[PDB]
Amino acid sequence: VLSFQLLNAPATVCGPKQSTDLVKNKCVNFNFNGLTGTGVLTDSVKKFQPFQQFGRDSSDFTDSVKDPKTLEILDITPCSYGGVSVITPGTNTSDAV
Amino acid sequence: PDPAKPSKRSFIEDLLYNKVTLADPGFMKQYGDCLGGVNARDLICAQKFNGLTVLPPLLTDDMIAAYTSALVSGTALSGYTFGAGAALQIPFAMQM
Ligand SMILES: *[C@@H]1O[C@H](CO)[C@@H](O[C@@H]2O[C@H](CO)[C@@H](O[C@@H]3O[C@H](CO)[C@@H](O)[C@H](O)[C@@H]3O)[C@H](O)[C@H]2NC(C)=O)[C@H](O)[C@H]1NC(C)=O
Ligand SMILES: *[C@@H]1O[C@H](CO)[C@@H](O)[C@H](O)[C@H]1NC(C)=O
């Protein structure tokens, strides 16, 4: 019988997967110790305590994470942040917006 | 309004505006002012992270005060005749 816990404490046993370095200033799909997500990652200055692997929020939305290879905190921000509005003069009128 | 400073508001209106506060004015918050830069996780940036946005009103504060300035000035020059048509000049002592 095998028993294990997931995503509560730093991990010691992981699957057979290889890393593909770090990409910056792009909203991409990352996977940190089995944590799929999407967003931009540029740099982080947040200070936290040890025995931590994820950054939570009041809305349970991830925003920071610790890189297990470089031992430094990162930041997560959604690829879309602002609002966009489009003004049109009507279909018959024209097509420029 | 006092012509000494172009505030476009009267003395009482400034006190009224300063007495009551607002949640978040401006609606001009960019990266660096949200978690893309550095914050203490302000409520406004959390709202925008979930598709919640607040739109500014069509009329600005300065434009609204212009209507009040026109209304008050019109009373001192015509009373209430301008409301039913064109303005009619009259001394204030006789108007009162
Ligand atoms: C695997 O994880 C280990 C920790 O378990 C990491 O060890 C670190 O390896 C890097 C390789 O770049 C070392 O950085 C190097 O250090 C000196 C700085 O003078 C220099 O040789 C290079 O410029 C480079 O920066 C780092 O010191 C080392 N940490 C230690 C020894 O405590 C490692 O990141 C991971 N292995 C990889 C990515 O191959
Ligand atoms: C658009 O233009 C056509 C041109 O004849 C007109 O008949 C039609 O009613 C217009 N459509 C709308 C939705 O106003």
Resolution (A): 3.0
Burial of B10 (0-12, 13-18, 19+ CB in 10 A): middle
Pairwise CB contact (< 8 Å): B50 & A59: yes
Distance CA A79, CA A29 (A): 11
B29 touches chain A (CB under 8 A): no
- Report the alpha-carbon angle A14-A15-A20, nearest 5: 95
- The answer to whether the beta carbons of residues A52 and A73 sit under 8 Å apart is no
The structure tokens listed for A32 are: 């940190």
What is the four-CA torsion angle of A9, A15, A18, A21, rounded to 10 degrees? -20
Least CB–CB distance from B38: residue in A45, A77, A78: A45
Residue A78 makes CB contacts below 8 A (sequence gap 6+) with A27, A38, A39, A40, B49
Say which residue the tokens 């950054």 belong to: A55
Q: How many CA atoms lie within 13 A of B15 on its CB side?
A: 3
Among A91, A82, A86, A44, which residue's Cα sits nearest to residue A63? Answer: A44
Distance CA B34, CA B45 (A): 6
Pairwise CB contact (< 8 Å): A58 & B49: no
SS3 readout for chain A: CCCCCCCCCCCCCCCCCCCCCCCCCCEEEEECCCCEEEEECCCCCCCCCCCCCEECCCCCCCCEEECCCCCCEEECECCCCCCCCCCCCCCCCCCCC
- The answer to whether the beta carbons of residues A36 and A28 sit under 8 Å apart is no
What are the φ and ψ backbone dihedral angles of A24, each rounded to 5 degrees? -120, 155
Distance CA A55, CA A39 (A): 14
Its sign, for the CA torsion B38, B41, B43, B45, is: positive
Interface test with B, best of A77, A80, A84 (most B CBs within 10 A): A77
What are the φ and ψ backbone dihedral angles of B58, each rounded to 5 degrees? -65, -40
- The angle that helices B11-19 and B61-78 make with each other, rounded to 10 degrees, is 140
How many CB atoms lie under 10 A from the CB of residue B35? 24
